[PDB]
Write a protein that binds this ligand. Sequence first.
Ligand code: 731
Ligand code: CL
Length: 212
Amino acid sequence: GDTKEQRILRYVQQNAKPGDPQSVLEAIDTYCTQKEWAMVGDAKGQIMDAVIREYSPSLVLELGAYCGYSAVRMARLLQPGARLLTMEINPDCAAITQQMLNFAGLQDKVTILNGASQDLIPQLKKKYDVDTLDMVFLDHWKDRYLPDTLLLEKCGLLRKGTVLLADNVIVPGTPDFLAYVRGSSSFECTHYSSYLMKVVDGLEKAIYQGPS
Ligand SMILES: Cc1nc(C)c(-c2cc(C(=O)N3CCN(c4ccccc4)CC3)n[nH]2)s1
Ligand SMILES: [Cl-]
């Protein structure tokens, strides 16, 4: 068997450099640009980097590791001792992600949780010893953004100033998630447009202010 995702890891393992997350980033960026696209960006990576650098989170939740691009891009910017938790529902992508972090030298900042987001979010406190989350990046199924944001509320995982950065909120779009965070007083929201497919997409930054 030879999947697109094995093919990406293998281009990285040949062209990027062991323990250099940026040559991993550019090799992936290079692969998805010249060889076959994958569901990856440097234009939205600039936005993702600015938000990591602005808020210096000590504990990040990512929903949707996939191949490990956005986990290499985040964890490369985290301070010593900070953690990334990444949930991946497909075990083969989870293996790609473990190897992509192992090659990039970041497998000690990341913990991969294999599971659907709404099964693992309730276990975060008991099992992975989380108190609150400093940042949350949502890049999974667009119809889970809103219910997972409220599930994170329920379980008391968001604090005042938690950053939620939501990808692909324009295309495919997350209309329900955007209406809620923009309309709720618990969230202060900034929309970052980024092109893609030559289409305007966007990320939403939504900062939690505390319950209503
Ligand atoms: C309830 C859930 N909890 C989690 C943790 C979920 C999750 C999302 C992802 C992910 O990263 N992508 C992106 C890639 N994509 C895809 C790409 C091409 C074709 C079809 C699908 C699958 C979803 N991995 N696990 S869904
Ligand atoms: Cl499910």
